[PDB]
Amino acid sequence: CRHVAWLGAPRSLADLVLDPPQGLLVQSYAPRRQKHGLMNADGWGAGFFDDDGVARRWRSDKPLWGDASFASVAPALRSRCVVAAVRSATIGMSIEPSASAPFSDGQWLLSHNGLVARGVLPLTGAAESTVDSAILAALIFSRGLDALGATIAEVGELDPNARLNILAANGSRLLATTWGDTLSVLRRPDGVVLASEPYDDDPGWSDIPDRHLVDVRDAHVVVTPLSSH
Amino acid sequence: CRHVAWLGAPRSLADLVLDPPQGLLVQSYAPRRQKHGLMNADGWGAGFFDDDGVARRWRSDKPLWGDASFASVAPALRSRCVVAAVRSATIGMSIEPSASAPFSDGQWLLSHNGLVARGVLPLTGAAESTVDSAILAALIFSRGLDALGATIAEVGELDPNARLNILAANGSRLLATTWGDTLSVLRRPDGVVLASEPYDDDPGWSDIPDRHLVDVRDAHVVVTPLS
Amino acid sequence: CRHVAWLGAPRSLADLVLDPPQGLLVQSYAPRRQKHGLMNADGWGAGFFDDDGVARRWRSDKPLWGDASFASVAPALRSRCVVAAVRSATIGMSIEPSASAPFSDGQWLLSHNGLVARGVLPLTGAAESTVDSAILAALIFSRGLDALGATIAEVGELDPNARLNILAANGSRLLATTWGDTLSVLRRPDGVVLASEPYDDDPGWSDIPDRHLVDVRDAHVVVTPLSS
Amino acid sequence: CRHVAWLGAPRSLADLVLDPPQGLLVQSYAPRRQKHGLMNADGWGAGFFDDDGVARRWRSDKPLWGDASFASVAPALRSRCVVAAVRSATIGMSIEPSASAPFSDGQWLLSHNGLVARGVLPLTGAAESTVDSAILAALIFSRGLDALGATIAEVGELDPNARLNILAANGSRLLATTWGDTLSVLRRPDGVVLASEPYDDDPGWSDIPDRHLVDVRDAHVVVTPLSSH
C-alpha cells in the first residue's frame, strides 16, 4: 500500500490524491519507492474531517485510477485534515471496502502499510474487517494513539517479519511510524504532508529514517526513534 | 426510477436525498407513488454543480441504501443545483454506473424516468451507455435542452408507449417533463424542489399534471402543456 | 435472508436457485414468508461440492436478480450438494461478499438467517467477516456441526432475542435449525431440498416446526426438537 | 489486453487461465510480452461453450487476481471451447463488465486486443457497450466471422494506427487475427491454444506473424495472410 496525509489549511482530496504528477493516483499503478507489490490496485480510501470535526470516509474495492465518481467529486471535498491510501492486498486477505484504509474509531483515521501475522495480534470484537491491517488498527486504537510507538515496537517484537508503517490523524494532529517501509515529509507554508513516497520531485521532501515515529501538531514536526529490542 | 432536483441556496446532497423521511433513500426500497416497479435498487446517481459551475457526479450500480461511503460523505457535499436518481432497471438493460442517471453533456445533468423503444431513436456514438435512457439522453442533448419540450413531444409520438419523464439542470435552471409518470414541486423560501414524489408531507407540495413542461429559473416555476 | 440447500443426484445451481417459479431468485425481490426485511438484495452466495468433495463458492454483494454472469454460468455448475442464500443486511452491517452466506471451514458450507447480539459471542480469529452471522458461523464451526443443536440452544439462551436459522452442508449431509424463522422440506425421488420457503407449489413441501433441528443423511430426514 | 482461447478436449477454466505459471492470471499484473509498467487490471472475462453448444460468459470490471469467486469456481467449469481475456482500458473508456471481452452474438465469443478510433466505425444499435472494442465486435458480427479477415483489413485501412488483434470462437472453431500485436499457438495432443503470449515455457509454442488470419478446427491450424494497403 501507499498512503498520504495532510494537516493544515484546507486542501481538496483531488489536490492531495489525484492531481500531483506522482501522487496516490499514479502510485496505484506506478509507485516509485515500493518494495512490496507491483501496484496498489486492490481498493482505496479517503478520509477527512469536515468543519465540525466529523470524520468522514469514502472507500472502495476497485482500482483508484478507474474510479470516475471519485475523479469527478474529489475536487469538491476540502479539508484541513486528510488520510488517504491505495491498497495492495496481502494474499488471502479480503478485497472489500471495509478492508481499505483508512480505518476509524470515530476520533482517529488510520492507515497501515505493511504486513503482520494476525496470529500474534490480540483477538478483538472491535475491528472493521477481518484482514490483518484492520486487526492491527483495532489494537492501536485500543492502546491509544499516544502509545503508538510502544504498540508498534511491541508488535514488531512479536512478529520479527512485520512491516508496520502507520499513518494516522485526528483533525489537529498527525502520527506516523516507519517500520520496514518508506515515509517522507513535506513542509508547506500552509501545512504538512506525510506520505509513503513524495507525490512530486519537490526538493523539500525529506525522508524519514526507518524505525521512527513522526508527530505533527500546530506546524511542528517532531521525529523520534522507536525502541528496537 | 425516481428522481429529485434542487435549485436554490446551497443544500447538502444528504439533506436532499438521505435525510427526508420519504426522500430518495426511502424511495429506493419503499416508494409511495410508483406504478412501474416496486423499488429502485439497480443503482443511483447524484449530480451537482460546484461553486464554479462545474458539473460533478457520483454514480453507482448498487442499491442506494447500502452505500456507506455516500452516507458518510453526502453531508459534506453542498450545492445550489442538484439532480439525483434511484434506478429501477428494465430487463435486458445493463446494470452499471454508466447506465445510472444523471447523464451529462458537461453543461446539463439529466435523468430519465420511464421507457422508450430504442428502435425509434437515432443511432448515436455519443451515448454514455447502451441502455435506452442513455440513448434518449444523447438525443435530448444533441437537440439542446431549450428544445426539450419539442424533443419529448416528438419521441412521444414516435413511440406512443413511451414514458418520458425528464428532470434536467444546468446550475441556474431546471427543466422537466411529465409524460406518463409523476412529478411534484415544492417552493421553499430558499429554492425549488422538483421530484417524482414528495419527500415529506409538507403542505406546500403540489403535483404537476401529465404531459407538461416545467421550467424553473430565478425562483419562477413556469408550467406549460407539451404541444 | 433466505437460503436453500440440495442433497441428492446432481442438480444445476440454476435449476435450484434461478429456474423455480418462486425460488431464491424471486425471493431476492419478492419473498413470500419473510417477516424481517422486505427483500434480499444485499448480496448472495452459492456454494457446492465438486466431484472430488471440494467446497466451492461464488459470493457477491449485489442483488441476485441483476447478476448476468451468474445467470449465464449457473446452468453449467452441477452438484450433488448445494447451499445458497440471498441476503438482507441488518442495519450497520457491512455489505460485502465475505459477509454473504455461505460461510465455510473447508468441510462445511453454512448459511445463517437471523440476528444475534455479537456481544454474547466469543471473540475469534477465524471469522470470515465482522458481521454477526460470520461470528456465529465461526462459533458453530469451532464447536463442530455435530454439536449444532447444542450451540444454537446455548446461543438462544445467551441472547433471548436471537433468531438462529442455520442451513449447512458437507457434501453428503444437510443440517438445519429453525429458531425464529421459516424452513420447509421437499423430498423428491432423487434428493432432498431444505429451503426458507418453498420454491414452487409442489404438494410435497412440508413446513418444519420452530425450534427444531433437521438432519438429512440421506436416505433419512430427522426433524428433532431443540432445547428451549 | 491479453487473451487466450482453447479448442480441444474438455479443459477447466482454471487449468487454462489461472494455473499456468505465466498464464492470463499472471498476465493481469505481470505480462511478459508487453513493456514493463503495463498491466491488464481493468476487468476480465471468460466465455465457454457447454455440452449443448450454448455460449456462456462470466465477466468482471475488477482485477482478475483479486476475484476469489472465480478462483474457487473456475476449476469446476470445463469446456471444449474457451475464450478469455484480461483488460487494459484505454483513454476515457468505461470500466464496466459489459465492456470486458468476450463479446457475443449468441453464436460466437470474441475478444479484441488493441485500439481503434470509434470515429471510423459505423454507428450501431447492437453493441454490448459504448467502448471501442464493443463497437468493433458489433461490426465484425454484422459482417460475419467468415469475413473477419476482410473486415479487419478494411478497418485497418480506415485507421492506420488501429491495433486489431481478434480472438474468436463458436464452439467448434477458433478464428484470430494479428494486426499490431502478435499471437502464439500451442498444439497439445488434446487440443490447440491460441494466446497473446505463451502461458509457460513449453517448447511447442510458436509465434504467428503480424497481419495474418488463424483458423483452427479439429486441432488443424491454418494460417493465411491478410490483405495489405
Swiss-Prot record, chains A, D:
Pathway note: Amino-acid biosynthesis; ergothioneine biosynthesis
Name the UniProt record assigns to this protein: Gamma-glutamyl-hercynylcysteine sulfoxide hydrolase
Reactions that this protein is recorded to catalyse: gamma-L-glutamyl-hercynylcysteine S-oxide + H2O = S-(hercyn-2-yl)-L-cysteine S-oxide + L-glutamate
UniProt-listed PROSITE patterns: GATASE_TYPE_2
Organism classification: Bacteria, Bacillati, Actinomycetota, Actinomycetes, Mycobacteriales
Record-level Gene Ontology MF annotations: hydrolase activity, acting on carbon-nitrogen (but not peptide) bonds, in linear amides
Function text: Catalyzes the hydrolysis of the gamma-glutamyl amide bond of hercynyl-gamma-L-glutamyl-L-cysteine sulfoxide to produce hercynylcysteine sulfoxide, a step in the biosynthesis pathway of ergothioneine.
GO process annotations (BP): ergothioneine biosynthesis from histidine via gamma-glutamyl-hercynylcysteine sulfoxide
PANTHER family in alphabetical order: GAMMA-GLUTAMYL-HERCYNYLCYSTEINE SULFOXIDE HYDROLASE, GLUTAMINE AMIDOTRANSFERASE DUG3-RELATED
SUPFAM superfamilies xrefs: N-terminal nucleophile aminohydrolases (Ntn hydrolases)
UniProt cross-references to NCBIfam families, sorted A to Z: ergothioneine biosynthesis protein EgtC
Enzyme Commission identifier(s): 3.5.1.118
CDD domains, per the entry: YafJ
